[PDB]
Amino acid sequence: FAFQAEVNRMMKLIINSLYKNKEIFLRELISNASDALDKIRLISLTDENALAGNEELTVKIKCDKEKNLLHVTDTGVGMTREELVKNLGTIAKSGTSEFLNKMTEAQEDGQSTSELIGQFGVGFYSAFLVADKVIVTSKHNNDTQHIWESDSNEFSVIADPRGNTLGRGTTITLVLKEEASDYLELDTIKNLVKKYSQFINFPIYVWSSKTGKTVWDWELMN
Amino acid sequence: FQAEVNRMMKLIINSLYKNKEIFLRELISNASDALDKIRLISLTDENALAGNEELTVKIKCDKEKNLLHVTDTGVGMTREELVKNLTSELIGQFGVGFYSAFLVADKVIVTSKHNNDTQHIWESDSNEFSVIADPRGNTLGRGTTITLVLKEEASDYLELDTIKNLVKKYSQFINFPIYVWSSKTTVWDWELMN
Ligand SMILES: [Mg+2]
Ligand SMILES: [Mg+2]
């Protein structure tokens, strides 16, 4: 079944080329972190134990130029295993069969090419504009911490062997594409975060340097 | 096989709806960008606009020869750029980029004059492409004319009102004026669209 996948994975390397300002991926991840935070914040106004697993309400972004990773972590509501599998699984599972089905449905639905290419730039799936692989670690008050992985073709999920390390919340880890290396640059990340966090009701930080040796810590962006 | 996989994706891409009118949006876009580059340059290079003082986009229709002309007084392209700046085809299938012109044209002719070279003419039918120095010499001043030899089924674009509507439809946020060689009570002249 290697051929069909060759067409599939290729069909994307081409569509990903239509996006000039792929930076929007960060905007979508911020937005989701914001939603998750609003959900648990809202719940806490009715349930005094809701924040027990982790009292802070923040979004924290960090770059790992060595591993070529970008981490976006929020202490929002988090997702249960079922949620990772259905809310992310079906969303990011556009393999050989899924990809084709959406196209035929799009073919008969009348869904123009525009509406199609546009789907690549909105929501969680927009992460794939700059990443070959997305790893999602999440902990929701109603379940144990789990890990979900996908390369936009398939997805897998297993209980985090490390246990509850998030307290509550979600970390989005992006294994960046060679050409998306700019998103590993501190100056690039700070500017964008500052750009897309103007309307979040929560503090957004970026792990940064501050000079007396050079030390690193969370720098508030909004 | 590269060629194999390519055609495969091609039919697939076209197996979906796409209002071919989007070709114009793409030409308007490219013109706007060309004008931006020279506009900026003119802020540092005092005589950058010497070749042609205006910064515009003028659309002309020739229902006789079945041709659509999109001329801008942007930065233009040198012979090298013509050859170089002109995955692109597939991208064209999505109605994006220079190649979107082939969604409506069997042949595309590009005339361009850049301050650093002489006027040249580039020509292509999507398969092969040719380039030669313009016999007429420098007639654009500076800028680029995209000439589309429209496909029979695309002759609808040659209609005045159709082109005007399409232009207005995609020139709302362009930082430069866009005209269409129109007529009025008969008199003929350029008519602003944005
Ligand atoms: Mg979202
Ligand atoms: Mg373009």
Curated annotation (Swiss-Prot), chain B:
Glycans are attached at N30, N116. Phosphorylated by CK2. Transmembrane segments: none annotated. Changing E26A: Loss of ATPase activity. Detected in heart muscle (at protein level). ATP binds at N30, D72, N85, F98. It is found in: Endoplasmic reticulum lumen; Sarcoplasmic reticulum lumen; Melanosome. Homodimer; disulfide-linked. Component of an EIF2 complex at least composed of CELF1/CUGBP1, CALR, CALR3, EIF2S1, EIF2S2, HSP90B1 and HSPA5. Part of a large chaperone multiprotein complex comprising DNAJB11, HSP90B1, HSPA5, HYOU, PDIA2, PDIA4, PDIA6, PPIB, SDF2L1, UGGT1 and very small amounts of ERP29, but not, or at very low levels, CALR nor CANX. Interacts with AIMP1; regulates its retention in the endoplasmic reticulum. Hyperglycosylated form interacts with OS9; promoting its degradation by the endoplasmic reticulum associated degradation (ERAD). Interacts with CNPY3. The SRT pseudosubstrate motif associates with STT3A during translation in normal conditions, preventing glycosylation of facultative sites until HSP90B1 folding is completed. Belongs to the heat shock protein 90 family. ATP-dependent chaperone involved in the processing of proteins in the endoplasmic reticulum, regulating their transport. Together with MESD, acts as a modulator of the Wnt pathway by promoting the folding of LRP6, a coreceptor of the canonical Wnt pathway. When associated with CNPY3, required for proper folding of Toll-like receptors. Promotes folding and trafficking of TLR4 to the cell surface. This is Endoplasmin. It comes from Canis lupus familiaris.
